[PDB]
């Protein structure tokens, strides 16, 4: 059946609409669930590496694995309880960590596929062709697109560069790595780190693993870092029907700063991340997590100090809340690198109707 109720810490007065609670340690579940989904959920819940791009790929891989493992029952057809199973999986995912736009798209695609082939064909012939098709799709709309984006970026970069970067966006890491290795230009990389997830640190580590000249900074230290420095790059999660940048935590402020100090910002996005859902603020739907992330006192993740703070429930009238997904302003980013080479962010849903 699962688990219900029992939530840690205060519920707060403001920003109460989305799930923030749940299974962290498993106790009593339905005896039919494939464990790979559960494992994935466990990973996603306590993840520090993933950021919009790889999650969907991982999900796809999991689905493929499931298909490979899937065996049709002797009585009922191929699609009878499969849909129910899928629904259950979705519910589990939501309980663990809310579904992204890419994930939704993937789900839609899966549904379409299900509709395409009606229950009449044998087992070993259908899924052989399905898995191949899915692989082909993956090759087409993801990796190739990424490659195209990279190549576009390559021509767009001039001579003598000093760049400030943020996030654990895989595409950006790929880009920077490419710059370092195959282009052999005068590239300087400055990294910004955030409190909820150590993405900046990871980026820095990756850079080190290549051998790049790295400056390391935070959200607070920005007034002195400019005083020569030109380009600013950000990692996007999804672009809505309005045209606003619906992305991760510390991006919008950086963009604003860039705008203030002359030189504009450039953001990268895929040709599948676009959504039909309409929202213009972070209050509508937001990725909210447990206040356990904002407990550690600086330095590193595993330290555990008995300093000043370490209580939430016992404290009378105290609201410790943090947000993960933000909505950045429309006019501030100028450059968008998508499947159609180059374009403005004001296009919004030009690819959505195109499909």
């Amino acid at each position: 059946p699962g688990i219900s109720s029992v939530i840690p810490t205060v519920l707060e007065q403001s920003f109460d609409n989305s799930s923030l609670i749940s299974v962290k340690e498993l106790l009593l579940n339905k005896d039919l669930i494939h464990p790979s989904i559960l494992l994935l959920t466990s990973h996603l819940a306590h993840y520090k590496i993933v950021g919009s791009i790889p999650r969907c790929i991982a999900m796809l891989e999991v689905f493929q694995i499931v298909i490979k493992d899937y065996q049709t029952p002797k009585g009922t057809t191929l699609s009878r309880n499969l849909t129910s199973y899928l629904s259950h999986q979705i519910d589990l995912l939501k309980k663990a960590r809310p579904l992204s736009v890419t994930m939704g798209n993937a789900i839609r695609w899966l549904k379409q596929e299900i509709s395409l082939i009606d229950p009449s064909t044998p087992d070993k012939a259908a899924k052989k062709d399905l898995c191949e098709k899915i692989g082909q799709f993956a090759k087409e709309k993801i990796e190739l697109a990424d490659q195209l984006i990279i190549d576009n970026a390559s021509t767009q970069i001039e001579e003598s560069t000093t760049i400030v970067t943020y996030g654990s966006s895989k595409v950006l890491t790929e880009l920077l790595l490419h710059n370092a290795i195959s282009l052999k230009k005068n590239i300087k990389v400055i990294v910004v780190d955030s409190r909820p997830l150590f993405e900046g640190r990871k980026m820095a580590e990756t850079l080190r693993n290549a051998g790049v000249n790295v400056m390391y900074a935070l959200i607070t230290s920005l007034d002195t870092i400019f005083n020569d420095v030109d380009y600013v790059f950000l990692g996007a999660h999804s672009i809505l029907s309005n045209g606003f940048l619906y992305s991760r935590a510390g991006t919008a402020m950086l963009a604003m700063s860039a705008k203030r100090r002359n030189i504009p910002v450039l953001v990268c996005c895929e040709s599948l991340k676009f959504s039909q859902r309409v929202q213009l603020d972070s209050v509508t739907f937001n990725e909210l997590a447990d206040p356990n992330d904002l407990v550690n006192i600086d330095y590193e993740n595993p330290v555990e100090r008995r300093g000043n703070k370490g209580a939430l429930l016992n404290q009378f009238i105290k609201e410790r809340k943090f947000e993960k997904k933000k909505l950045a302003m429309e006019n501030k980013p100028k450059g968008n690198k998508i499947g159609g080479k180059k374009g403005s962010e004001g296009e919004s849903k030009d690819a959505s109707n195109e499909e």
Binding site: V214, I219, T220, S221, A252, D298, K321, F322, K326
Partner: protein
């Protein structure tokens, strides 16, 4: 001028220097107090015979102190104030010794045109007055301060390091008729623990407290009503040095959204010297606190700073013990406390 003249007459200068260098002394108020004490010691013990020479000596001492530590503005300010106090008395004396018209309190054309007493006691009294002034600032702010914040309004608080700002907040919170929601920005490499402490204090006081990370400033900005700075030093044109980390960006954001930006500090923190360079006055922190290891960290050059400088364009209000002032007006206040020649030493 070296320390050859002062060795057995005054010894505490070295101790003061030591306190400055290795940061044994903490909080600008304490520094100011120390400076006052030093001045008192100088006055009670040393010999003068002449007045101009004494003034020159004092100036030299001030210069030396400045050279020893540039980030200690309060120390300088107090000295300047004392000099100003001396100067007026000296001027008065000269008029009696010899034995004038002015449109206002000070004249510009007097510089162009050619122009024993118990002054020691007066000088001593000046120091006492200064001490008294230092003692209570919050009592002269609260009569103006608890008039701005209203019901169902939301406050945003960068820099909780200052002791005055907290007090100001507390005084406002005391009132039963007034209710407000508080958003607190953390400040990672320099302000975190202090911020936490502030939050705890707020909780204790029984007010609605919201702890906000440095990245989550943008999302809540549609609801933000007022902005308050925990500044450490005030200057001529309006620009201020803030008490470490996470002030500039927030101010910029406020400016963008046209959110009112308040500042509470005091006139002892106010300096008659100009902040011509950000790089000269602002001191930087430590690299060790950010990231562990040393051998791979030779490649990873980390940038982190203590103090923060905010332009006078963003900040509009400077409420002190006297009253409410502007960045376009505060210069005159400084002049009323520090004289024309006393600026350069």
């Amino acid at each position: 001028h070296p320390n050859a003249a002062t060795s057995d007459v005054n010894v505490t200068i070295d101790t003061f220097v030591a306190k400055l260098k290795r940061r044994q002394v903490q909080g600008s108020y304490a520094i100011a107090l120390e400076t006052l004490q030093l001045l008192m010691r100088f006055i009670s013990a040393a010999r003068w015979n002449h007045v101009n020479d004494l003034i020159e000596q004092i100036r030299d001492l001030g210069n030396s102190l400045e050279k020893a530590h540039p980030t200690a503005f309060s120390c300088g300010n107090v000295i300047r104030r004392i000099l100003a106090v001396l100067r007026d008395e000296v001027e008065e004396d000269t008029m009696s010794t010899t034995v004038v018209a002015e449109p206002l309190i000070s004249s510009m054309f007097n510089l162009l045109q050619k122009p024993k007493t118990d002054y020691r006691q007066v000088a001593i009294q000046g120091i006492k007055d200064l001490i008294d002034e230092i003692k209570n600032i919050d009592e002269g702010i609260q009569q103006i301060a608890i008039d701005l914040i209203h019901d169902h309004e939301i406050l945003l608080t960068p820099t909780p390091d200052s002791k005055t700002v907290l007090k100001f907040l507390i005084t406002a919170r005391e009132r039963s008729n007034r209710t407000f929601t508080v958003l607190v920005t953390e400040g990672f490499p320099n302000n975190t623990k202090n911020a936490h402490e502030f939050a705890k204090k707020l909780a204790q006081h029984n007010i609605e407290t919201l702890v906000v990370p440095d990245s989550a400033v943008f999302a809540l900005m549609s609801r933000v009503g007022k902005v308050i700075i925990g500044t450490k030093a005030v200057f001529v044109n309006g620009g201020t040095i803030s008490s470490n980390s996470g002030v500039s960006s927030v101010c910029e954001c406020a400016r963008e959204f046209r959110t009112p930006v308040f500042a509470v500090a005091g006139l002892y923190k106010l300096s008659p010297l100009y902040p011509f360079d950000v790089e000269k006055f602002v001191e930087f922190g430590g690299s060790q606190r950010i990231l562990p290891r040393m051998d791979p960290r030779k490649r990873l050059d980390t940038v982190n700073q203590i103090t923060d400088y905010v332009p006078p364009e963003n900040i509009d209000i400077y409420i002190t013990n006297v009253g409410g002032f502007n960045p376009s007006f505060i210069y005159r206040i400084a002049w009323d406390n520090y004289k024309q020649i006393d600026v350069h030493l």
